[PDB]
Structure 1
Amino acid sequence: VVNQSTQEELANRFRALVEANEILQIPGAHDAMAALVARNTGFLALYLSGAAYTASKGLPDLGIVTSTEVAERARDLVRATDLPVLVDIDTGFGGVLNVARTAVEMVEAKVAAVQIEDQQLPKKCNGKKLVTTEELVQKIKAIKEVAPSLYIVARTDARGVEGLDEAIERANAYVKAGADAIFPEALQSEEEFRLFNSKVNAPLLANMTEFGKTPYYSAEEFANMGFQMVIYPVTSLRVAAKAYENVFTLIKETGSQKDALSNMQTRSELYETISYHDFEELDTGIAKT
């Protein structure tokens, strides 16, 4: 709260990063603290996956979270860093109208971009089912209608369930509806990357998630195969939960945490990252005047 950019300013800052020559590395941050470390690391864009946010709250990725829920966490990310944030919003949390509200809720939270997919949920009473191309298109039309200032990324899981060629047709159809970029989940080879890149006239997103169906290509490698941005969605929570495990086990069976001191953020680093000095100069600046 010590001295920024508006939603469209953050949105236009996000587009230029995608339009830029170099590939846009987008790390996911489940909380505002992690968002700060990403900013301090040098990253220019932010990401919020439902998978990490749910796990952060101890819930499974089953769509049992509300759209407002995500908008609040996305707000903590923007407030703390003033960086362009890409938000995973599943299927828009409902029908065309729920998507519209979802879209507006994101703009209010000064979110630069959102990510909607073509999966069919809620699934009937553990499988990947898709909606009709028209159904997601309608959702895309709704977003552009109620929130034109919002950058759009469209996720398609058609490669797995339908096929490589049906995924491209869906992609180009999502593009003509208003989607600025395409998230093609589960492309299986370098050749599939390049062919998808050439057949679709839109920047491609890379899901660099761990222990998944994607080889650990470098960001430079994704850039040469036809991708203009790359995400590391659940990485933040992944290293965090592993760290809790270490320090908790230590305290539990040794009786102290004196062995994990090397794996900790010191007082000064917390102070600095949290910008205590800027809160002090504010209050003191008002004080001496």
Structure 2
Amino acid sequence: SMSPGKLFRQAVANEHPLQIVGAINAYCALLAENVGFKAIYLSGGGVANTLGLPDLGITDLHDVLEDARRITAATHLPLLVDIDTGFGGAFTIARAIKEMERAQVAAVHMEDQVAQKRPGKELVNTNEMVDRIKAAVDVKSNDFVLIARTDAYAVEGLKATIDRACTYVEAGADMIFAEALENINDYPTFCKAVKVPVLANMTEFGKTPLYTAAQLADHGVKMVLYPRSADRAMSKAALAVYEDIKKHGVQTASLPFMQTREALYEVLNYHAYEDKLNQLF
């Protein structure tokens, strides 16, 4: 009935806050949907790492687009997709926006880091990020959600970050991704300043400490992101199975840690396929 963008907007409005969980593939998206999340996330780092590449902007529009298409094919849950810095200049960004819309994506986030390579965290000038934003806004539909992400806190401090975010909003950004604020009591100031919904990145093993969804909502945050949480647990679990099989010559020890065949069928809605398989035959 509603467009993906509209669904996302509605989820951000109704939830306090909206928890957005990362899913690396369609099946994970279904698991998340099953647990009752209202929005899901495609991590740029996830897309890269899953290919066995580092999160260094090596991936392009197609790497991400393919992963996004697979997910949106399997669920109507609004998906937020990480488009890094926009994969190139103004034309690439425009293409990215159009392609993500076509792929039934709800929202993207684009950040103000530098792209290019022939000192780690370097940002573009505010003006350049505005250029990026304008390129995106000029071709985007109304419903579709552009989240501008700023990486400025660690480098430039709270005031400079708020300044950027505000300029980004004026440039047409729908929502703001505030990367790695260190003090919970910075959020109320930040949220009040930028007016639009704010996303907080609750990734593990970062510089940021872990706050609860409730805590962050209390400090004015509208969205909480869990970008790699599931992926990290999956990787450990997979490694464990591999090690078990290798060391023991059989997977007996891994059996309690595996999802049952029954649960798999449930998630796939498998019985609905056997119903139509007999109704025609």
TM-score scaled to structure 1, two decimals? Answer: 0.93
Counterpart pick for 1:155 among 124, 128, 149 = 149
Asked if 1:128 corresponds to 2:121, the answer is yes
CA distance in 1, matches of 2:66, 2:77: 15
1:40 maps to 2:17: no
Aligned to 1:194: 188
CA contact (8 A) 2:182 2:209 kept: no
Report the CA distance between 1:21 and its aligned residue.
4.9
The aligned residue for residue 274 of structure 2 is 280
Aligned-partner SS, 1:135:
helix
Residue 88 (structure 1) aligned with residue 104 (structure 2): no
2:29 is equivalent to residue 26 of structure 1: no
Q: What do residues 135-184 of structure 1 show as CA deviations (whole Å, max 9, x unaligned)?
A: 11122222222122420111101111122111111001110111111111
- AA aligned to 1:145 is D
Amino acid at match of 1:137: V
- Name the SS for the 2:259 alignment partner: coil
Q: Deviations over 1:108-135 (max 9, x none)?
A: 110000000000112x456111112121
One-letter amino acid matched to 1:37: L
User: 1:97 aligns to what?
Assistant: 91
In the other structure, the counterpart of 1:240 is 234
Q: Would you say 1:141 and 2:147 are equivalent positions?
A: no
Unpaired segments of 5 or more residues in structure 2? none
SS at match of 2:104: coil
Contact 1:159 1:167 in 2 (8 A): yes
Cα deviation digits, residues 64-114 of structure 1 (max 9, x gap): 112022111111111111110000001110111100001111011100000
Asked if 1 retains the 8 angstrom alpha-carbon contact of 2:42 and 2:82, the reply is: yes
User: Which residue does the alignment assign to 2:199?
Assistant: 205
Deviation at 1:275, TM superposition (A): 2.1
Residue 118 of structure 1 corresponds to which residue in structure 2? 112
- Give the drift of 1:281: 2.4
Matched, 1:69 2:63: yes
CA contact under 8 A between 2:4 and 2:144: conserved in structure 1? no
Can you give the 5+ residue segments of structure 1 that lack an aligned partner in the other structure? Answer: none
2:138 counterpart letter in structure 1: E
Q: Secondary structure at the match of 2:264?
A: helix
Equivalent residue number for residue 78 of structure 1 = 72
Q: What secondary structure does 2:74 align onto? A: helix
Q: Distance in 1 between matches of 2:20 and 2:258?
A: 25
Residue 13 of structure 1: aligned partner: 7
Give deviations 1:10-58, integer Å, cap 9, x for gaps: 1101101112252100000011111110010100101001111111111
Letter in structure 1 aligned against 2:18: L
Query: What is the alpha-carbon root mean square deviation over aligned residues?
Result: 1.4
Distance in 2 (CA, whole Å) between partners of 1:118 and 1:105 is: 21
Question: How many aligned positions are there?
Answer: 280
**Contact 2:72–2:79 under 8 Å retained in 1:** yes
How far off is 1:217 after superposition?
Answer: 0.9
Cα deviation per residue 1:206-264 (whole Å; 9 max; x = unaligned)? 10101112211111111001100001001121011100111111111111110111110
1:239-258 equivalent positions in 2, closer than 5 A: 239-258=233-252
| Distance in 2 between residues matched to 1:206 and 1:266, nearest whole Å | 34
Residue of structure 2 in register with 1:222 after alignment: 216
For 1:126 and 1:280, locate their aligned partners in 2 and report how far apart those are by CA, in whole Å.
57
Using the size of structure 2 for normalisation, the TM-score is 0.96
CA contact (8 A) 1:144 1:150 kept: no
What is the letter of the counterpart of residue 174 of structure 2? D
Is this contact kept in 2: 1:68–1:105, CA < 8 A?
Answer: no
SS class of match (1:168): helix
